[PDB]
């Protein structure tokens, strides 16, 4: 692939295959030129090496990459993907995050969500909802309305937000309480407001901790967050019958 400045970048396979291809053709040629046994064996030996390096560089002398000192990555190494090994884990859409602060007013089942975040998150819901209510002509039309942050969209947003809960996650996810669902209450600010009783499970303070938020798109998922992951359902701990939602 091209880059900026006219620079080019490539996967290390291309280097390796090139070696197979070249040594394979050099040999095809020597068979008709009637080379002496010493050379064809030598070439037959080299071809073995290039192939072995393509598939699993490492079980031999380990060929190093073009100019760069570092050795090239062979097919078998792309099959793993974790150099013990790395945990994770993939990146997801409809998701955000920020610093968390308090929020004593909340009920157990709700959470505080910045106005701005909410907007950018539910964007597609909002777009359809405008043109389903005839405020926007087309989709392109809604695109711009929400860009302008017209007073009418703030009303529409309260609608797509009503019975639609979000999920909130904290740094290490030890037990399943690491992710819990909340009904979103709209907030002016840029801070996520969390219920004080739930802090315990999450192991959250307000010493600068941060949490992420996820939107359950499909319907089944909305319900799965209302019936299983909803803050109110997880009142007791699954490690021992005693309640985790404890006055702090």
């Amino acid at each position: 692939v091209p880059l900026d400045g006219g620079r080019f970048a490539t996967s290390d396979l291309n280097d390796l295959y090139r070696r197979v291809i070249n040594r394979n053709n050099r040999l095809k040629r020597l068979l008709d030129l009637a080379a002496p046994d010493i050379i064809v064996r030598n070439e037959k030996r080299m071809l073995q090496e290039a192939v072995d390096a393509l598939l699993d560089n490492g079980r031999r002398g380990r060929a190093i990459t073009g100019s760069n000192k570092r050795p090239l990555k062979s097919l078998a190494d792309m099959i793993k993907g974790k150099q013990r090994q790395n945990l994770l884990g993939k990146r997801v859409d409809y998701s955000g995050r920020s610093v968390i602060t308090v929020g004593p007013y909340l009920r157990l089942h709700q959470c505080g969500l910045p106005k701005k975040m909410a907007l950018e998150l539910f964007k597609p819901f909002i777009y359809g909802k405008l043109e389903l209510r005839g405020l926007a002509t087309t989709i392109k039309a809604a695109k711009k309305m929400v860009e302008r942050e017209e007073a009418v969209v703030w009303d529409i947003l309260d609608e797509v937000i009503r019975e639609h809960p979000v999920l909130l996650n904290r740094a290490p996810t030890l037990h399943r309480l690491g992710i819990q669902a909340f009904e979103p209450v709209l907030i002016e600010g840029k801070a996520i407001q969390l219920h004080p009783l739930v802090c315990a499970a999450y192991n959250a303070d307000f010493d600068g901790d941060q949490m992420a938020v996820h939107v359950p798109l499909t319907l089944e998922a909305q319900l799965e967050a209302r019936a299983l992951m909803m803050s109110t359902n997880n009142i007791l701990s699954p490690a021992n019958g005693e309640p985790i939602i404890v006055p702090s």
Partner: protein, 199 residues
Amino acid sequence: IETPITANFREGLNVLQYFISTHGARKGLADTALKTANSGYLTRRLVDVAQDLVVTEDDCGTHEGIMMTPVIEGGDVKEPLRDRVLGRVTAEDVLKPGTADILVPRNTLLHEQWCDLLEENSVDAVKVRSVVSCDTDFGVCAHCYGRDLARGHIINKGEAIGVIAAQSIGEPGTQLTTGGLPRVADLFEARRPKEPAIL
């Protein structure tokens, strides 16, 4: 160190007092970091071994179960009997101090009014159904597991008890201290000790 920090924090700690205070602190911090890293490595290995373990059967109907008694260490009890039985289903019907009268029938789930009934009576030993005992092939029977949930009822079909089990163990693992988190690691890993005893 033989001479301890005689002063406190309302008082001032002098130079040699602080300097010595330091090591304890620095070791502490490092120690928590490592104990955080190791608690997760366990859980990872734990979830690996469980994972696929799901509540499949409704009731495998075996009578085989383990025998529950209060822990009782040394002089007096370290953890009482009520806690160990609560929420577990009974393997066979237990009786009062005098027989002929069964207080609780064959496989009844022992809850709060039952435990209070088994505390009203001097009952001290109970045989209970366990996942280790459960016949069920490829899964665990609903009855054998018990109930515990964030819901107060018996466990439902299809819940991945395995994963939830794992999580439960390594999560508070950060708090732990032969012994400590590494001892726990050794137990699960089933390691033979240096000088073993033959029977």
